[PDB]
């Protein structure tokens, strides 16, 4: 869900980028 | 040796993942294993596994030293 930093949804919720939510 | 109550033993082979073939007598004439005595790390001297750096927990990094001495 939104509480997991290792997913697209979780990175979107935290407003950050990384391997799972690239820019 | 009583009769009718003991599983009869037959000649058998045990094959390991490392290709080792051990010859013995067993109740099953063909056995396959994943580790034997000739490839287990504790038997082949040390066979250092994924951990081999002695934990390097002392001051054995020297952590730079580019700062003033």
């Amino acid at each position: 869900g939104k509480g997991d930093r290792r997913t697209r949804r979780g990175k979107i919720w935290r407003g950050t980028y990384g391997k799972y939510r690239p820019r | 040796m009583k009769e009718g109550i003991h599983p009869k033993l037959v000649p058998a082979r045990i094959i390991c993942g490392c290709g080792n073939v051990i010859e013995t007598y067993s109740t099953k004439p063909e056995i396959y294993v994943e580790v034997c005595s000739k490839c287990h790390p504790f038997y082949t001297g040390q066979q250092r596994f994924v951990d081999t750096e002695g934990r390097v927990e002392r001051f054995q990094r020297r952590y730079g030293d580019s700062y003033r001495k």
């Binding site: - | 009583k2 109550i5 003991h6 599983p7 033993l9 045990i14 390991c16 051990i22 010859e23 013995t24 007598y25 067993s26 109740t27 099953k28 056995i31 294993v33 994943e34 580790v35 034997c36 005595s37 287990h40 504790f42 038997y43």
Partner: protein
């Protein structure tokens, strides 16, 4: 008698080295191997289950010998056990079957133990005997994951003709028992 490699190795490489190290003047002074006794203290089959049959079948496959039932010698409330009820199994291995079982143990059973770092060097009886304890039964080659229903351990008694620990220790390391430092 079946030509077991472990018995062959004892008479070829171990006996001549033992007399070299300890200087026995008699060929019957050098330590021999007497018997192996495997005990399974189930304790869960007192009255809640007749699951002794499942363990008897598994033990017979590992050693080739049908084990015998051991009964309680008295009643104890704290264990909720009555006198005369079956609470264990035991099998005695001698001669060829003794040699065959130890060869499998040293070669295909002990290497399969989780986080094996060697055997206890302080488990020697003090008069020339050794005892080790196992927690798992699926490490033996004849046991597969399919027919395993419950986890069970055992105690293995190794009895030698050696009089002292130091002479019994020498026989076991040469035979192939790996010990911790």
């Amino acid at each position: 008698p079946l030509d077991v490699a472990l018995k062959r190795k004892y008479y070829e490489e171990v006996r001549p080295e033992l007399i070299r190290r300890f200087g026995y003047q008699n060929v019957w002074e050098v330590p021999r191997l007497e018997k192996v006794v495997i005990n399974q203290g189930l304790g869960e089959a007192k009255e809640d289950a007749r699951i002794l049959e499942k363990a008897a079948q598994e033990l017979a496959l590992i050693t080739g010998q049908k084990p015998a039932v051991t009964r309680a010698k008295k009643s104890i409330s704290n264990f909720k056990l009555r006198k005369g009820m079956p609470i264990g199994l035991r099998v005695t291995l001698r001669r060829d079957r003794m040699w065959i079982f130890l060869e499998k143990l040293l070669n295909v059973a002990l290497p399969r133990i989780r986080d094996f770092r060697g055997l206890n060097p302080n488990s020697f009886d003090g008069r020339g005997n050794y005892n080790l304890g196992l927690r798992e039964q699926l490490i033996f080659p004849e046991i597969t994951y399919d027919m395993v229903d419950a986890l069970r351990g055992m105690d293995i008694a190794v009895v030698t003709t050696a009089e002292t620990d130091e002479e019994a220790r020498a026989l076991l390391e040469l035979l192939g028992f790996p010990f911790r430092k």
